[model samples]
Target: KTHVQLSLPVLQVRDVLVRGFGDSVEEVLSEARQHLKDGTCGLVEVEKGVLPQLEQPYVFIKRSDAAPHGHVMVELVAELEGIQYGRSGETLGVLVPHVGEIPVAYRKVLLRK
Candidate 1:
């Protein structure tokens, strides 16, 4: 495992997607550089037990009305499938495969309003 160190203030975002397994950030940057226009390899998170099967896909919008006072709103519109849960119960249920090969990480899909 790699330890990512922070020097100062930091921000955290759930990594709903994982692709290349490079060791360092630069290596991933190089990998991303070759796929600059690639939308075919990204994925997102969804609830556990959200999908009926492993192969079906769906699209919807996730809205958050609790944006900071000045900001209006936060929403994510996504089309996704599959499901996976981490050790800590953080589940990512979308699998946007490449050439019919889903990443080794993602699993099936599930539920929420």
Candidate 2:
């Protein structure tokens, strides 16, 4: 018999308030903070594009370099380690693999509500 093995990235989910870029991290940070404070954390987008009548515990896409113009590009929360910062190493969306400009998915935080 032969031996085989496989390894995968780990899930890096955290309760961060100042991570990601969009509407300015500071602004996104502030607004999201308000949601958490107001308890609207429940309405945060959790499953990407699927805004359940339910809600998120407190957490999307775009993933980097905040936009002061308007669109707040909320960063992806839960994901497999890959690019994470430098604003370029960012892996938008939840559980994203090393990513190859390909498509895949987890979001359970950063609600604008």
Candidate 3:
């Protein structure tokens, strides 16, 4: 099989909301580009209402009370919906929504399935 542009998931995060949330990952590989490092992505655990809700078309933020209750695991593969490969989400400095900057550890990976 040929190599594809897949950001390996080697980043993981689980913490409380801080208006809210890493630099170690950057030490290994800078996340200023596409938020992915040499075939690396991220895996995060979010509460049910922590991140509000992504309305249709990935637009609009309904807003919530800093959902610091509950836990829902999630995986970020750099590429979302098989449509964010080259046309979006590049050149970022880890400023997440509601949570502000993010801190992750042992997450991001690349799969060949």
Candidate 4:
């Protein structure tokens, strides 16, 4: 006789990657902030030239500067339904199940190479 053990793996099933092109980070965040202020969360695609009801709760933007020159484009990754942001990179205001909204203030930002 022998005993067997098995376990199921957890999968993401879905993922959202929001990206935007701009001269600076401010430019990208500006648009993302506006969308949040408008009580709009998520992405909407034009179906047959018309807007649909598909929208994501969590929307973010990151500037892609892989090349010396790139066109400015707004890429929205939606349907996340979650958000996490904070200073000091210490703790997250929002957690799983319990949603918390806190205003983020950027005093200074540094990028590492």
Off by over 4 Å in 1: 1-21, 38-40, 46-113
The per-residue C-alpha lDDT of model 3 at residue 78 equals: 27
Off by over 4 Å in 2: 1-22, 43-113
Following a full C-alpha superposition, what root-mean-square deviation does model 1 have from the true structure? 14.8
Question: Which 10 successive residues of model 3 have the least lDDT summed?
Answer: 55-64
Question: In lDDT terms, how accurate is model 1?
Answer: 0.28
Best-first order by lDDT: 2, 1, 3, 4
Question: Going through the candidates in order, what is the number of backbone clashes in each?
Answer: 10, 10, 22, 1
lDDT of each: 0.28, 0.30, 0.26, 0.25
Per residue, candidate 1 scores C-alpha lDDT tens digits across 1-113 of 11111111111113323323244334433342233224333333445543333222332223233323232222222322333111122223233223333333422121121
What TM-score does prediction 3 earn? Answer: 0.24
> Which window of ten consecutive residues has the lowest lDDT sum in model 4?
90-99
Q: Give TM-scores for every candidate, taking all chains together and pairing residue i with residue i.
A: 0.23, 0.24, 0.24, 0.23
lDDT tens per residue, model 4, 13-62: 12212222233334434454454334322322122422122233322322
Better of 2 and 4 by TM-score: 2
Candidate with maximal lDDT: 2
Off by over 4 Å in 3: 1-33, 38-43, 53-104, 111-113
lDDT tens digits, residues 13-97, model 2? 3322323323342444455444334433222223454323212321233334443333333442322133222232243332222
